[PDB]
Symmetry: C3
């Protein structure tokens, strides 16, 4: 798809792009943006309006291109896996995310000293991906600790990410989900699926609709709809699971609808049983 947006980029003295903010997708409007253009000599950066036009099927070719792809996900214009992100790691700079804005890692000790004349400097994060909410707050969502959702995450209307929840880029919820556990990069869960406190979804892997992962559970295989994983149980692709009298690698049960995975005291095994109903 051809996608375009006008945004405002933070650039170092040497032209490295620390960030770009696109408040809207597909708009040539600048009036939100012209008053934010300027130089910050304490951070040694310039903020400048840019217009970015990409082919979402092509691999990104520069930092601006990469930042628009992340915005397209979090604005929910594209779902996870529907936009090419190949090489994005090589295009994003590591950045010190402060209360004054993005700062370069190179020379940060001098930057901090300079900014400290203006007030207390707080560092929120040091990373190549910023906190999603500082760029887009999508409609119909709650996030308890907004450190834990990266820009590039897709959170559908009706989603709550609790404080224990975590959503990486190119990942998230396709419908209304309670997320109290970790959605890895490249993982999606569908409508009605609830991820229990401290649960881990590895990621290749997705879950369908109305699944329930218990607190401190884990899922290393794709599942379909209406599956349950008991609290405290980690189903890896290599976990041995008893189903209809034979032991299978859990990968053999990948994609299933309507299974409950639980410990079984009678066999001593992990078991998968039908979910009724």
């Amino acid at each position: 798809t051809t996608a375009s947006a006008t945004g405002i980029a933070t650039l170092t003295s040497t032209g490295d792009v620390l960030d770009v903010w696109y408040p809207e997708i597909g708009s040539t409007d600048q009036s939100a943006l012209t008053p934010l253009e300027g130089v910050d000599e304490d951070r040694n950066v310039t903020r400048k309006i840019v217009t970015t036009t990409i082919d979402i099927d092509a691999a990104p070719t520069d930092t601006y291109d990469a930042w628009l792809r992340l915005h397209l996900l979090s604005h929910r214009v594209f779902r996870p896996h529907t936009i090419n992100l190949d090489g994005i790691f090589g295009l994003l700079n590591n950045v010190v995310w402060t209360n004054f804005g993005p700062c370069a890692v190179d020379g940060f000790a001098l930057t901090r000293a300079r900014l400290s004349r203006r007030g207390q400097v707080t560092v929120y994060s040091v990373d190549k991906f910023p906190r999603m909410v500082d760029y887009v707050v999508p409609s119909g969502v709650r996030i308890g600790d907004a450190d834990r959702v990266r820009l590039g995450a897709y959170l559908a209307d009706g989603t709550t990410v609790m404080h224990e929840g975590f959503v990486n880029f190119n990942a998230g919820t396709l419908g209304a989900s309670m997320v109290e556990g970790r959605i890895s990069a490249g993982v999606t869960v569908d409508d009605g699926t609830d991820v229990g406190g401290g649960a881990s979804i590895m990621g290749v892997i997705s879950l369908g609709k109305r699944c329930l992962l218990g607190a401190n559970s884990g899922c290393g295989i794709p599942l379909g709809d209406d599956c349950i994983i008991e609290a405290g149980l980690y189903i890896t692709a290599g976990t041995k699971v008893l189903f209809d009298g034979s032991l299978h690698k859990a990968s053999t049960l990948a994609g299933s609808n309507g299974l409950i995975f639980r410990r079984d005291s009678v066999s001593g095994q992990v078991v998968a049983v039908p979910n009724t109903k």
Copy 2:
């Protein structure tokens, strides 16, 4: 109980209450508060002094009433479950919690653009419950990551909530506890009880005094005093546990004093054994 307090409320142009701060319980004093009254045209809100009087046994009837109930818990005036919170979810607005204060979710993209003339906008959270510490810091406590304690939490003198700890509203510690795991809404633990790193207490459920939950353990049943749950073990109400030679649902062991729950290599079962001493 009749409870009353004077506070300062943030109101939208249409009268929705984004927050109320009650610095003290039971005081008619305003001198902390009159200089904070005003309008913020970038957030399109007004901050106004209010006096709120409630019956703690009655269900809350408006947003102001709901916010005082949360303050009464975090100020430790009322313990969890001793104040009626029925319907509170329907009375609290979802709010964007920023470094500039609460903002409405409706029109937030315009609000952000307006505030950005003043400085970098950071969103801490998007939720109906704010971070407790921005309203009350109770005496004798430490909180590592204060994103992870909601207003409405009760933390008794001597409590440390470590970074991995989480305490929801209507929940917390009744005495001195080390909290490195998740205390769900409606859960309490009593004096001396320590919740290990990444442990999960579901919640109906409480723990008594001097209990020890190992790292990455779970507890889905009420327990009494001096119980231990081994690291990595999740005791759900349906978990089968061997005690005095029979297999029980762990719910049959609910309320016990002095039990250790651990994996047993000899039986292959979860076992509960006496804690000596």
Copy 3:
């Protein structure tokens, strides 16, 4: 070792040290620092330049001494366990870590009211240890949620601490590691070791090089190099593990190189098997 540095300390009206920042180790230079000296009457503190000289083998004797020891760790001048920290808990004050800087816990409700004339007050943490990154950002690292690394942590070049990661003081990574789980105080992991999401390393305990802890795993024993612990499995020192046909307490397997710890469906036991290769 004799270690010395010039820093700037925040002192209460009664002389309690809330913090000290040493921007550099071993320098008599003040030019970063003289403009930050002053009084803040809303917090009732003074910020003053200090020069601190210690013997790293001696127990710390005052708050200044304690804060330099933490900086020496995070600046990576000293590795964990190579600097005496005995009694440090008794020398650090509990502090309210705000967007305005450190505040005393005594009288904090008045302080908050005073600061609120200047703008929204946000409390990041309440603790004796601050967030490392507000004092030192070491080179070559990423930290997703910088609430979760305490000052006193040692993070070697090439380390990423993901959002689920946590690193305490006197703890961390000796080489390039992906940290998505909890490194307790006094725990180190060596080069190449990756700590999976939600994994717990207790701490006495270290891991060697190229170890892999699966998501939601636990490790309560020291291990050497090239060990793996399966996702969802907690190896405590008392866990019974089958190795070469006998059941051992996992403590008997402490220090091993090249072992995989996993659940075994054939025996019903935890098993340790050779890592090939």
